[PDB]
């Protein structure tokens, strides 16, 4: 299997875990904790990925060649030229 | 004056094409909405709060769920990027 770390549940938490296992929602209190940590990691993994994405996007824009005046209508027109070629 | 990076233009065309799959018209409305939001920076340069988590002197102006990543220079505004915002915890 894998490595082990010992965790200390609070009185109110032990009570709620007990009902869940009894109701059959979970086989054991240890599996419920395993779910809780996995959910937390997913959240952290996502947040870290998104924060890193934006950090890289910024340096990417700065390094993406030289700036040009802003005209939206040119962009709106340029996009259509690629749509027609798609068909 | 307002200048944009080659990446930022690529963002808006990508954004436009995505919406254009559903309706080309709707894509025009959203990009128009983005522009109106960028042009507000000429009168209100600090509408977007500083975003040190993204870049040293980066700022971010919110349009929909997308961010207008920009920087302020002497005499002009530099539009760096337009990326989707940090995604919510909803999984």
Author numbering:
A (entry chain a): 3 to 89
B (entry chain A): 2 to 92
The publication says:
Our work focuses on the ParD-ParE family of toxin-antitoxin (TA) systems, which are often found on bacterial plasmids and chromosomes. Most TA systems include a stable toxin that can inhibit cell growth but that is normally bound and inhibited by a cognate antitoxin. ParE toxins likely restrict cell growth by targeting topoisomerases. The previously-studied ParD2-ParE2 and ParD3-ParE3 systems from the α-proteobacterium Mesorhizobium opportunistum are highly similar, with 41% (antitoxins) and 42% (toxins) identity.
